[PDB]
From Swiss-Prot:
GO terms for molecular function: iron ion binding; tryptophan 5-monooxygenase activity. This is Tryptophan 5-hydroxylase 2. Brain specific. Keywords: Disease variant, Iron, Metal-binding, Monooxygenase, Oxidoreductase, Phosphoprotein, Serotonin biosynthesis. It comes from the Eukaryota. Interacts with DNAJC12. GO terms for cellular component: cytosol; neuron projection. It is an enzyme of class 1 (oxidoreductase). Changing residue 65 to S: Risk factor for bipolar affective disorder; may results in moderately decreased function in serotonin synthesis; decreases solubility; decreases thermal stability; catalytic activity as the wild type.
Amino acid sequence: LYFQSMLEDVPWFPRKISELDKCSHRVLMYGSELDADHPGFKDNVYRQRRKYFVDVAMGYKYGQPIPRVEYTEEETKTWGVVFRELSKLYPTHACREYLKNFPLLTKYCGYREDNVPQLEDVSMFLKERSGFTVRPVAGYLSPRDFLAGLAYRVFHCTQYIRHGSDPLYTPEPDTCHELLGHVPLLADPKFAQFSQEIGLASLGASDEDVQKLATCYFFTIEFGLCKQEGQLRAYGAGLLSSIGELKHALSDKACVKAFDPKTTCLQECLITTFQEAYFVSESFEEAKEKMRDFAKSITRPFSVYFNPYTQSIEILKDTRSIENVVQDLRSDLNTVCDALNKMNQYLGI
Ligand SMILES: [Fe+3]
Protein backbone atom coordinates (compact mmCIF):
# COMPACT_ATOMS: atom_id res chain seq x y z
CA LEU A 1 0.00 0.00 0.00
CA TYR A 2 2.93 2.31 0.75
CA PHE A 3 4.53 1.53 -2.61
CA GLN A 4 1.20 1.92 -4.40
CA SER A 5 0.67 5.44 -3.06
CA MET A 6 4.26 6.38 -3.92
CA LEU A 7 3.80 5.86 -7.67
CA GLU A 8 0.37 7.53 -7.75
CA ASP A 9 1.96 10.91 -7.01
CA VAL A 10 4.39 10.71 -9.93
CA PRO A 11 3.83 10.61 -13.73
CA TRP A 12 3.56 7.16 -15.31
CA PHE A 13 6.69 5.52 -16.71
CA PRO A 14 7.23 2.09 -18.31
CA ARG A 15 8.60 -0.38 -15.76
CA LYS A 16 8.88 -3.21 -18.30
CA ILE A 17 10.40 -3.17 -21.78
CA SER A 18 7.05 -4.40 -23.11
CA GLU A 19 5.33 -1.34 -21.66
CA LEU A 20 7.60 0.89 -23.74
CA ASP A 21 5.22 0.30 -26.67
CA LYS A 22 2.80 2.75 -25.04
CA CYS A 23 5.46 5.46 -25.34
CA SER A 24 6.39 4.59 -28.92
CA HIS A 25 2.85 4.94 -30.25
CA ARG A 26 1.94 8.11 -28.36
CA VAL A 27 2.72 10.23 -31.41
CA LEU A 28 1.76 13.89 -30.98
CA MET A 29 2.48 14.75 -34.61
CA TYR A 30 2.74 12.13 -37.35
CA GLY A 31 5.35 12.41 -40.09
CA SER A 32 2.64 12.82 -42.72
CA GLU A 33 1.66 16.11 -41.08
CA LEU A 34 4.00 18.33 -43.10
CA ASP A 35 4.55 21.90 -41.95
CA ALA A 36 3.33 24.80 -44.09
CA ASP A 37 6.87 25.88 -45.00
CA HIS A 38 7.94 22.31 -45.77
CA PRO A 39 9.50 21.94 -49.26
CA GLY A 40 7.21 18.96 -49.91
CA PHE A 41 3.99 20.60 -48.73
CA LYS A 42 2.58 20.58 -52.27
CA ASP A 43 4.32 17.35 -53.29
CA ASN A 44 1.66 14.63 -53.45
CA VAL A 45 4.26 12.03 -54.43
CA TYR A 46 6.31 12.92 -51.35
CA ARG A 47 3.20 12.92 -49.14
CA GLN A 48 2.47 9.37 -50.30
CA ARG A 49 5.86 8.23 -49.02
CA ARG A 50 5.50 10.13 -45.74
CA LYS A 51 2.14 8.42 -45.17
CA TYR A 52 3.73 5.08 -46.05
CA PHE A 53 6.46 5.39 -43.41
CA VAL A 54 3.85 6.35 -40.83
CA ASP A 55 1.81 3.21 -41.47
CA VAL A 56 4.94 1.05 -41.35
CA ALA A 57 5.99 2.57 -38.03
CA MET A 58 2.49 2.27 -36.56
CA GLY A 59 2.52 -1.43 -37.42
CA TYR A 60 5.65 -2.06 -35.36
CA LYS A 61 5.28 -4.10 -32.17
CA TYR A 62 7.75 -5.24 -29.50
CA GLY A 63 9.45 -8.52 -30.36
CA GLN A 64 8.79 -8.14 -34.07
CA PRO A 65 11.78 -7.36 -36.33
CA ILE A 66 11.93 -4.00 -38.12
CA PRO A 67 10.57 -4.49 -41.67
CA ARG A 68 12.88 -3.86 -44.63
CA VAL A 69 12.17 -0.66 -46.56
CA GLU A 70 12.60 -0.39 -50.33
CA TYR A 71 13.78 3.19 -50.82
CA THR A 72 13.13 4.77 -54.22
CA GLU A 73 15.84 6.06 -56.56
CA GLU A 74 15.14 9.68 -55.62
CA GLU A 75 15.40 8.87 -51.92
CA THR A 76 18.69 7.02 -52.40
CA LYS A 77 20.07 9.89 -54.47
CA THR A 78 19.08 12.32 -51.72
CA TRP A 79 20.84 10.07 -49.20
CA GLY A 80 23.90 9.94 -51.44
CA VAL A 81 24.29 13.71 -51.54
CA VAL A 82 24.11 13.93 -47.75
CA PHE A 83 26.48 10.97 -47.38
CA ARG A 84 29.21 12.52 -49.55
CA GLU A 85 29.14 16.14 -48.37
CA LEU A 86 29.35 15.01 -44.74
CA SER A 87 32.11 12.44 -45.34
CA LYS A 88 34.34 15.30 -46.50
CA LEU A 89 34.16 16.88 -43.04
CA TYR A 90 34.06 13.85 -40.73
CA PRO A 91 37.79 13.08 -40.56
CA THR A 92 38.42 16.68 -39.46
CA HIS A 93 35.25 17.48 -37.51
CA ALA A 94 33.87 14.23 -36.08
CA CYS A 95 35.16 12.80 -32.80
CA ARG A 96 37.34 9.70 -32.45
CA GLU A 97 34.32 7.59 -31.48
CA TYR A 98 32.58 8.53 -34.73
CA LEU A 99 35.56 7.72 -36.94
CA LYS A 100 35.98 4.39 -35.15
CA ASN A 101 32.43 3.13 -35.68
CA PHE A 102 31.63 4.68 -39.06
CA PRO A 103 33.81 2.26 -41.07
CA LEU A 104 32.21 -0.57 -39.09
CA LEU A 105 28.80 0.73 -40.15
CA THR A 106 29.98 0.70 -43.77
CA LYS A 107 30.98 -2.95 -43.38
CA TYR A 108 28.08 -4.41 -41.39
CA CYS A 109 25.20 -2.00 -42.00
CA GLY A 110 25.99 -0.98 -45.57
CA TYR A 111 26.66 2.73 -45.10
CA ARG A 112 27.10 3.70 -48.75
CA GLU A 113 26.03 6.54 -51.03
CA ASP A 114 24.14 4.10 -53.26
CA ASN A 115 22.32 2.32 -50.43
CA VAL A 116 20.18 3.49 -47.52
CA PRO A 117 20.86 1.41 -44.36
CA GLN A 118 18.01 -0.58 -42.81
CA LEU A 119 17.07 -0.14 -39.14
CA GLU A 120 17.02 -3.90 -38.48
CA ASP A 121 20.70 -4.11 -39.44
CA VAL A 122 21.53 -1.07 -37.32
CA SER A 123 19.60 -2.40 -34.31
CA MET A 124 21.45 -5.73 -34.29
CA PHE A 125 24.69 -3.81 -34.78
CA LEU A 126 24.10 -1.50 -31.82
CA LYS A 127 22.75 -4.25 -29.56
CA GLU A 128 25.82 -6.40 -30.15
CA ARG A 129 28.18 -3.47 -29.55
CA SER A 130 26.58 -1.20 -26.94
CA GLY A 131 23.24 -2.82 -26.13
CA PHE A 132 21.33 -0.01 -27.81
CA THR A 133 18.41 -0.76 -30.14
CA VAL A 134 16.39 1.33 -32.57
CA ARG A 135 12.64 1.55 -33.11
CA PRO A 136 10.73 3.06 -36.02
CA VAL A 137 8.61 6.00 -34.87
CA ALA A 138 5.59 7.40 -36.73
CA GLY A 139 6.36 10.99 -35.74
CA TYR A 140 7.10 13.27 -32.81
CA LEU A 141 6.87 11.91 -29.27
CA SER A 142 6.72 13.96 -26.08
CA PRO A 143 10.11 14.54 -24.43
CA ARG A 144 8.93 12.28 -21.60
CA ASP A 145 8.17 9.39 -23.96
CA PHE A 146 11.32 9.77 -26.04
CA LEU A 147 13.58 9.95 -22.98
CA ALA A 148 11.76 6.96 -21.49
CA GLY A 149 13.09 5.03 -24.48
CA LEU A 150 16.66 6.00 -23.66
CA ALA A 151 16.22 4.50 -20.18
CA TYR A 152 15.99 1.13 -21.93
CA ARG A 153 18.73 2.13 -24.39
CA VAL A 154 16.08 2.34 -27.10
CA PHE A 155 16.38 5.14 -29.65
CA HIS A 156 13.25 5.94 -31.66
CA CYS A 157 14.21 6.58 -35.28
CA THR A 158 12.41 7.95 -38.33
CA GLN A 159 12.57 6.08 -41.64
CA TYR A 160 11.54 8.76 -44.13
CA ILE A 161 13.97 10.69 -46.31
CA ARG A 162 14.03 14.50 -46.47
CA HIS A 163 12.60 16.20 -49.56
CA GLY A 164 14.88 15.78 -52.56
CA SER A 165 14.65 19.44 -53.56
CA ASP A 166 17.39 20.35 -51.08
CA PRO A 167 19.35 17.41 -49.58
CA LEU A 168 21.60 19.76 -47.59
CA TYR A 169 18.65 21.02 -45.54
CA THR A 170 15.98 19.51 -43.29
CA PRO A 171 13.53 21.08 -40.80
CA GLU A 172 12.86 17.66 -39.27
CA PRO A 173 14.91 14.63 -38.14
CA ASP A 174 14.77 12.33 -41.18
CA THR A 175 16.47 8.92 -41.32
CA CYS A 176 19.59 10.51 -42.82
CA HIS A 177 19.94 12.48 -39.59
CA GLU A 178 19.44 9.38 -37.45
CA LEU A 179 21.84 7.10 -39.31
CA LEU A 180 24.62 9.63 -39.91
CA GLY A 181 24.18 11.59 -36.69
CA HIS A 182 23.03 9.40 -33.82
CA VAL A 183 23.89 5.81 -34.79
CA PRO A 184 27.70 6.05 -35.02
CA LEU A 185 27.83 7.32 -31.42
CA LEU A 186 25.20 4.91 -30.10
CA ALA A 187 27.67 2.14 -30.94
CA ASP A 188 30.01 3.57 -28.30
CA PRO A 189 29.46 2.05 -24.82
CA LYS A 190 30.46 5.14 -22.82
CA PHE A 191 28.10 7.26 -24.91
CA ALA A 192 25.30 4.71 -24.59
CA GLN A 193 25.60 4.83 -20.79
CA PHE A 194 25.54 8.62 -20.97
CA SER A 195 22.39 8.61 -23.12
CA GLN A 196 20.72 6.11 -20.78
CA GLU A 197 21.50 8.37 -17.81
CA ILE A 198 19.25 11.13 -19.15
CA GLY A 199 16.50 8.59 -19.71
CA LEU A 200 16.67 7.09 -16.23
CA ALA A 201 16.60 10.56 -14.69
CA SER A 202 13.31 11.36 -16.45
CA LEU A 203 11.39 8.31 -15.20
CA GLY A 204 8.72 9.56 -12.80
CA ALA A 205 10.08 13.10 -12.93
CA SER A 206 8.03 16.28 -13.26
CA ASP A 207 7.40 17.95 -16.61
CA GLU A 208 9.66 20.83 -15.57
CA ASP A 209 12.57 18.48 -14.86
CA VAL A 210 11.88 16.48 -18.03
CA GLN A 211 12.07 19.70 -20.04
CA LYS A 212 15.44 20.37 -18.40
CA LEU A 213 16.76 16.93 -19.33
CA ALA A 214 15.46 17.48 -22.86
CA THR A 215 17.48 20.70 -22.96
CA CYS A 216 20.57 18.88 -21.70
CA TYR A 217 19.86 16.28 -24.38
CA PHE A 218 19.73 19.10 -26.92
CA PHE A 219 23.07 20.74 -26.12
CA THR A 220 24.88 17.40 -25.85
CA ILE A 221 23.42 14.49 -27.82
CA GLU A 222 22.04 16.83 -30.48
CA PHE A 223 24.42 19.81 -30.40
CA GLY A 224 27.50 18.92 -28.37
CA LEU A 225 31.26 19.28 -28.64
CA CYS A 226 34.01 17.15 -27.09
CA LYS A 227 37.60 18.20 -26.43
CA GLN A 228 39.96 15.45 -27.57
CA GLU A 229 43.71 16.03 -27.23
CA GLY A 230 43.34 19.81 -27.45
CA GLN A 231 41.56 19.62 -30.79
CA LEU A 232 37.85 20.43 -30.84
CA ARG A 233 35.50 17.77 -32.21
CA ALA A 234 31.73 17.61 -32.67
CA TYR A 235 29.73 14.65 -31.37
CA GLY A 236 26.25 16.18 -31.46
CA ALA A 237 23.97 14.52 -34.01
CA GLY A 238 22.55 17.85 -35.15
CA LEU A 239 26.07 19.03 -35.92
CA LEU A 240 27.06 15.79 -37.66
CA SER A 241 24.01 16.19 -39.91
CA SER A 242 24.15 19.87 -40.88
CA ILE A 243 27.28 20.46 -42.97
CA GLY A 244 27.07 24.21 -42.36
CA GLU A 245 26.68 24.22 -38.58
CA LEU A 246 29.32 21.50 -38.30
CA LYS A 247 32.09 23.73 -39.65
CA HIS A 248 30.67 26.65 -37.68
CA ALA A 249 30.81 24.92 -34.30
CA LEU A 250 34.51 24.28 -34.89
CA SER A 251 35.16 27.75 -36.30
CA ASP A 252 36.38 30.91 -34.57
CA LYS A 253 33.16 32.91 -34.82
CA ALA A 254 31.26 30.61 -32.46
CA CYS A 255 30.75 30.99 -28.72
CA VAL A 256 32.07 27.87 -26.99
CA LYS A 257 31.31 27.04 -23.35
CA ALA A 258 31.50 24.04 -21.01
CA PHE A 259 28.64 21.64 -20.32
CA ASP A 260 27.08 22.61 -16.98
CA PRO A 261 23.77 20.71 -16.47
CA LYS A 262 22.20 23.27 -14.12
CA THR A 263 23.05 26.21 -16.38
CA THR A 264 22.74 24.45 -19.74
CA CYS A 265 19.19 23.27 -19.00
CA LEU A 266 18.17 26.94 -18.86
CA GLN A 267 19.66 27.73 -22.27
CA GLU A 268 17.22 28.36 -25.13
CA CYS A 269 16.99 25.61 -27.75
CA LEU A 270 16.98 27.30 -31.16
CA ILE A 271 15.32 25.22 -33.92
CA THR A 272 16.05 28.02 -36.37
CA THR A 273 19.86 27.65 -36.48
CA PHE A 274 22.39 28.60 -35.35
CA GLN A 275 22.79 28.19 -31.59
CA GLU A 276 23.98 30.95 -29.24
CA ALA A 277 26.60 28.73 -27.61
CA TYR A 278 28.09 25.24 -27.85
CA PHE A 279 28.89 23.22 -24.74
CA VAL A 280 31.97 21.03 -24.36
CA SER A 281 32.57 17.84 -22.39
CA GLU A 282 35.99 16.26 -21.85
CA SER A 283 34.60 12.76 -22.39
CA PHE A 284 31.47 10.60 -22.31
CA GLU A 285 32.55 9.35 -18.89
CA GLU A 286 32.53 12.92 -17.56
CA ALA A 287 29.29 13.55 -19.44
CA LYS A 288 27.83 10.47 -17.75
CA GLU A 289 29.15 11.85 -14.45
CA LYS A 290 27.43 15.17 -15.17
CA MET A 291 24.05 13.48 -15.60
CA ARG A 292 24.64 10.93 -12.84
CA ASP A 293 25.06 13.87 -10.48
CA PHE A 294 22.28 16.01 -11.95
CA ALA A 295 19.66 13.30 -11.39
CA LYS A 296 20.03 13.87 -7.65
CA SER A 297 18.56 17.35 -8.07
CA ILE A 298 15.41 16.02 -9.73
CA THR A 299 12.63 15.47 -7.19
CA ARG A 300 11.02 12.04 -6.91
CA PRO A 301 10.21 9.73 -3.94
CA PHE A 302 12.51 7.00 -5.25
CA SER A 303 15.59 6.16 -7.27
CA VAL A 304 15.71 3.87 -10.29
CA TYR A 305 17.99 0.95 -11.11
CA PHE A 306 18.00 -0.56 -14.60
CA ASN A 307 17.89 -4.36 -14.76
CA PRO A 308 19.59 -5.33 -18.05
CA TYR A 309 18.76 -9.03 -17.63
CA THR A 310 14.98 -8.52 -17.60
CA GLN A 311 15.02 -5.12 -19.34
CA SER A 312 12.96 -3.58 -16.55
CA ILE A 313 13.12 -0.76 -14.01
CA GLU A 314 13.86 -1.61 -10.38
CA ILE A 315 12.31 0.91 -8.00
CA LEU A 316 14.61 1.48 -5.02
CA LYS A 317 11.98 2.26 -2.38
CA ASP A 318 13.01 0.00 0.50
CA THR A 319 16.23 -1.15 2.16
CA ARG A 320 15.74 -4.63 0.70
CA SER A 321 16.19 -3.61 -2.93
CA ILE A 322 19.14 -1.41 -1.97
CA GLU A 323 20.85 -4.15 0.04
CA ASN A 324 20.25 -6.48 -2.90
CA VAL A 325 22.16 -4.11 -5.18
CA VAL A 326 25.06 -3.72 -2.74
CA GLN A 327 25.34 -7.50 -2.39
CA ASP A 328 25.66 -7.86 -6.16
CA LEU A 329 28.40 -5.22 -6.09
CA ARG A 330 30.20 -7.24 -3.41
CA SER A 331 30.07 -10.23 -5.75
CA ASP A 332 31.39 -8.20 -8.68
CA LEU A 333 34.19 -6.82 -6.50
CA ASN A 334 35.07 -10.43 -5.70
CA THR A 335 35.49 -11.13 -9.41
CA VAL A 336 37.73 -8.05 -9.60
CA CYS A 337 39.88 -9.54 -6.84
CA ASP A 338 40.03 -12.85 -8.71
CA ALA A 339 41.26 -11.09 -11.85
CA LEU A 340 43.80 -9.21 -9.75
CA ASN A 341 45.05 -12.47 -8.23
CA LYS A 342 45.24 -14.24 -11.59
CA MET A 343 47.27 -11.32 -12.92
CA ASN A 344 49.75 -11.74 -10.07
CA GLN A 345 49.81 -15.49 -10.66
CA TYR A 346 50.73 -15.26 -14.35
CA LEU A 347 52.24 -11.81 -14.98
CA GLY A 348 54.05 -11.83 -11.64
CA ILE A 349 52.62 -8.52 -10.43
FE1 LIG B 1 18.53 14.03 -33.33
